[PDB]
Amino acid sequence: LGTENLYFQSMVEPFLGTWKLVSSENFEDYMKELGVNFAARNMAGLVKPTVTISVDGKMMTIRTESSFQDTKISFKLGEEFDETTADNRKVKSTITLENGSMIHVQKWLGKETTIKRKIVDEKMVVECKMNNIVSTRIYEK
Ligand code: NA
């Protein structure tokens, strides 16, 4: 399936690397919408996580490290998977990559949140949305 990954390697390549948070907007209110309490969202909002995006064949891994978590997800694009989030939600996740945007949808208890990533001027721009609450986080590598 080497030959089967020609277009795959092209679309995933811009996302690969060890990204570090440089700026954040409205992340506390986004976390509030997820159901995280004030201490957790206030303290987590102050740190700068490292997000490592890698691939092994067709399997993508995204690792998130901070003072408060060390979590990772491994998945194939477009294939739903079970995920236990850092804030202890048990969700159904599907991650796709179209038009240069990696879109991660999490579904649980009839609720939904979307995490969209794109590369703009070599930076990774991450948009987190839940019920019309939007947070934007920018990372550099
Ligand atoms: Na954190």
UniProtKB/Swiss-Prot annotation:
Q: Which UniProt keywords apply?
A: Cytoplasm, Lipid-binding, Phosphoprotein, Transport
Q: What is its main location?
A: cytoplasm
Residues modified to Phosphoserine: 23-24, 54, 101
- One annotated GO biological process: long-chain fatty acid transport
The highest taxon in the source lineage is: Eukaryota
Q: Which InterPro entries match?
A: Calycin, Fatty_acid-bd, ILBP, Lipocln_cytosolic_FA-bd_dom
Q: Which Pfam families match?
A: Lipocalin
Q: Which PROSITE patterns match?
A: FABP
CDD domains in UniProt: FABP9
GO MF annotation list: long-chain fatty acid binding
The entry's cellular-component GO terms read:
cytosol; nucleus
Instruction: Tell me where in or outside the cell this protein is found.
Output: Cytoplasm
- The reply on keyword Phosphoprotein is yes
The record's comment on protein family reads: Belongs to the calycin superfamily. Fatty-acid binding protein (FABP) family.
**By what name is this protein known?**
Fatty acid-binding protein 9
